[PDB]
Every structure is written in structure tokens, then in C-alpha cells.
Write a protein that binds this DNA or RNA. Structure first.
Ligand code: MG
Ligand code: MG
Ligand code: MG
Ligand code: MG
Lengths: 244, 244
DNA sequence: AAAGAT
DNA sequence: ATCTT
DNA sequence: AAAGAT
DNA sequence: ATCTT
């Protein structure tokens, strides 16, 4: 399927190529930095060609946002099935040691999930799936990156800003957690687990409907939350209480 | 001076080189996207080797943040004068057609400018200068060609996501405006003007001291600013009356 | 964690 | 990291 | 703009 | 665009 093909392609590409610099048309190569600010942008660009290749193979049109602060990164759909759109968003985070727990910021909880057309390319109801392609890289020990340039012949001497990288594709609701991922930018936090759990999809919500209801009613500050719910347990007790 | 040299080097590099993609160690090239999220990352990486080259020529050490949420992008200082550090921050914005008015988000106004050691590599008082290297690019409509990968022998064929790029170096206080550049992330907004005004330094503050005082007392919401000051005129009248 | 930095 | 209405 | 999206 | 305490 589109999903199984996309997952195989992502694994393959990631295993075969290592990004090491930005290149100018003149052949000069500028090395990379090791922070997520840099790598989140790189991994997103690294994914575009793959997604588009697999999408075309399945008769899907791929669309990117026109307004820069709109979701999702890629919208896929067959022209004949306009209301069966698939959303794909890329997220990046890091680890210091390969066997540690990770968590992602998965997007806002006050935009399109609460307002059907807010900051989204197409109305939320036209999407039947929301996939997250997550990249986890291991940071390099040296806090001092290369500060010079290279030429095409020196590709093998360019230090890579990461020790390793892992990728997975999973439905957003499945990896969503119950604690906000950011404060002032009101983001949904993912589960705080090991890589394996994201791949296998061992989440905390019972269904996508529960995931949505929980985040559509989550309050912004702990002050407001203490009278409603601060986690999944309290949310379920809040349902029992009659949503008051 | 270090300043005149840095400006010349940036200006020169920018005209002679055009970044067109990210390269993998195996020689595969991935095209760039056309939004600021991508270009701001590329321009920073582009600037790094140039800054380090000119700094070394003048006997300056160049240091980058150890932690991701620290300002500035680059700290420069001579080993013999540690209390005369120079901060350089790279800022990017876009334009739809050449010669339109532009504005930048210049960083927070509630961190290191209000607390000497908050989110900054070195205590704020050890810096004698705060420079902004700003990039302005004219956005270009993405095509189908920018959605496939390329090889080294095809460098000239890869379509560029920008029409033209202009760069400038100026003091932060000189280009700082009197209205916030962002709400929830509390950022200082720059003056809203044409590129030449940034180069020439036609701002609104009379001194760096006025810029600092203005932003150290600026309130986060218009409701809190209604009784204080919302712009430079009101701020001056407020000062005149005794800050009450 | 929550809140507020980049 | 900065954009949009 | 100011406020709230990414 | 995510991170840090
Ligand atoms: Mg965006
Ligand atoms: Mg994205
Ligand atoms: Mg940073
Ligand atoms: Mg920067």
C-alpha cells in the first residue's frame, strides 16, 4: 500500500545516504551544524523526494502549504477522492545515547483540531489519516563543528553532525501523549518512550476519537487544568463526572 | 576594521555563490524548499565559515552556543580582552517582489536584556556590540523539478528556491523598532522599512541606551501597554513626565 | 512538570 | 527558528 | 497591530 | 521550527 511502500522507502533511503553539507551550484560545500534547528530542516528536505516518488507511484497528488505557518508538510490525495486526504508531518528530536527515551512536540492543540479551517491547507474534515514521520538522531560528543568549506573531492572528510539516525512512520493519535509538549506555543506532547514503542505504536489513547476529545478540551495552564484534568486518568474521571 | 571586512566578505560571497541543495556523502543531492524555515537555516550555515575566516584574521576567537536555546549565534572576542565581546546573530525574512518593505523578528525582549545571564552564552554585560547579519530573499514558486534528487554532474540544473538575495550587517539597536515582532514568543520587532534603510541605519532609537530602556519596560499585551506606552512617541512622553 | 526560552 | 491576518 | 499560528 | 530547567 502507499503506507507500506512509504515506510520501506524511508528505511532504505535513510540507511543508504548520510547528509553532510549544503552545496552551491559552483561546487563549494558548507558543513552542517549539530543542533535540531539545523537537522529538523535537513530531514524534512531529505524526505520530500521520497514522499513524492511513492505518492506518484500510487496516483496521489502531493501538495505543500502556501502560507508558511500552515499544517501539514505534505497533503496527499487522488483527484477522484477529494475527501480522503492524507496528512504527513515531519518531526525531529535527538538523544545522547541510543537506548534512551525520547518525546516529540507534535503540533498545536488549539488550531485546526478545535477550528476546522484554522492554519490548515484543507479543512480538517477532508483528511482521513494523519501520519507523523519522525527522525531521531544521536548527537555527536564534540560541541565544536567544522568552520571551513570543502570541495566535491573532499566529501569523505566532512564531519557528520550526528552519530546515527532512526526514522519511523506512525499515526499521530497513536503516539500522542497526555502532557503538553510546549507551553507558550501550546503543542501536543508525544508519549515519552523508547524508539521501539513509536514504531510498534504502544500509545496511551484507546482511539483517535479519545485522542481528539482529550486535546480539544485540554486547558492551557495548570491553574485551569486542576479543575478539569491534567492526564489521561483524570480525563476519564472527568468523562464519568459528566464533563464538568 | 573587523566590521568593514566582515561586510565586504559577506557581500562578496553572496554574489559569487548560490546554494542549491544538501549533499550526501555518497554524492546524492536533494533540492531546497522555498520558505524561511529552510532559508534561514541555509544562510546561517552559509555565513559560518566566512565569519570564522574574518575573525581569525583579526585575532578573534569564535564561539557558538553549547545549548540550543542560547543567544547569540556567534560570540567573538580576543583572548586578551574577554570583557569586550561581540555578538553576531543571523536573521532572515522574505519578500514577494523586490523593493517591498521588510521587517525581522530580532530575538526576545524578556530574556538576557532583562536578566544578565538568561539564555545567553556569556553574561550580557561582557558584550560591547550586538550585530545582526540580515538576509532578505525574494520567494520563488516551487516546481516539479525541485521534487527529485540529482547528481554532482547536474549541479547547474537544480532549480533555486530564491530569486535574489540581499545581505546587510548592522547594530541591533539601530534597526530595532518600537512594536513587538511576535506575540506569544515575545520578540523585538525591527523597523518596517526598505532594505536600504537597514544598510544606512535609519532607525527610530537615538541611542543604544534608549533602545534597551524601551524594551526593558515594554509590556507583553496592549491591555498592559494602554496605560504605559505603545510606541516611541508615548515612551518619550512617559519619560518626560517621570515614568508615571 | 510547566512554563517560557530559541 | 519566523509568519499571518 | 496584536495576537496567536508554525 | 523544538528545547531546557
Ligand atoms: Mg511552516
Ligand atoms: Mg514540517
Ligand atoms: Mg539555537
Ligand atoms: Mg541563529
Amino acid at each position: 500500500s502507499l503506507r507500506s511502500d512509504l515506510i520501506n522507502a524511508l528505511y532504505d533511503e535513510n540507511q543508504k545516504y548520510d547528509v553532510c553539507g549544503i552545496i552551491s551550484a559552483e561546487g563549494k560545500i558548507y558543513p552542517l551544524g549539530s543542533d535540531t534547528k539545523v537537522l529538523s530542516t535537513i530531514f524534512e528536505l531529505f524526505s520530500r523526494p521520497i514522499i513524492n516518488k511513492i505518492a506518484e507511484k500510487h496516483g496521489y497528488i502531493v501538495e505543500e502549504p502556501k502560507q508558511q505557518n500552515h499544517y501539514p508538510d505534505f497533503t496527499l490525495y487522488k483527484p477522484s477522492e477529494p475527501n480522503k486526504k492524507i496528512a504527513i508531518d515531519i518531526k525531529t528530536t535527538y538523544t545522547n545515547k541510543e537506548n534512551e527515551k525520547i518525546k516529540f512536540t507534535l503540533g498545536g492543540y488549539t488550531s485546526f483540531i478545535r477550528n476546522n479551517t484554522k492554519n490548515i491547507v484543507y479543512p480538517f474534515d477532508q483528511y482521513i489519516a494523519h501520519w507523523i514521520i519522525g527522525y531521531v538522531y544521536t548527537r555527536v560528543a564534540t560541541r565544536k563543528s567544522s568552520l571551513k568549506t570543502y570541495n566535491i573531492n573532499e566529501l569523505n572528510e566532512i564531519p557528520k553532525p550526528y552519530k546515527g539516525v532512526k526514522v519511523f512512520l506512525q499515526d499521530k493519535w497513536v503516539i500522542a501523549g497526555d502532557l503538553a509538549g510546549s507551553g507558550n506555543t501550546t503543542n501536543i506532547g508525544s508519549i515519552h518512550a523508547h524508539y521501539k514503542d513509536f514504531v510498534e505504536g504502544k500509545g496511551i489513547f484507546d482511539s483517535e476519537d479519545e485522542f481528539l476529545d482529550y486535546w480539544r478540551n485540554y486547558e492551557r495552564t495548570s491553574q485551569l487544568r486542576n479543575d478539569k484534568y491534567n492526564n489521561i486518568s483524570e480525563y476519564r474521571n472527568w468523562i464519568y463526572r459528566g464533563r464538568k
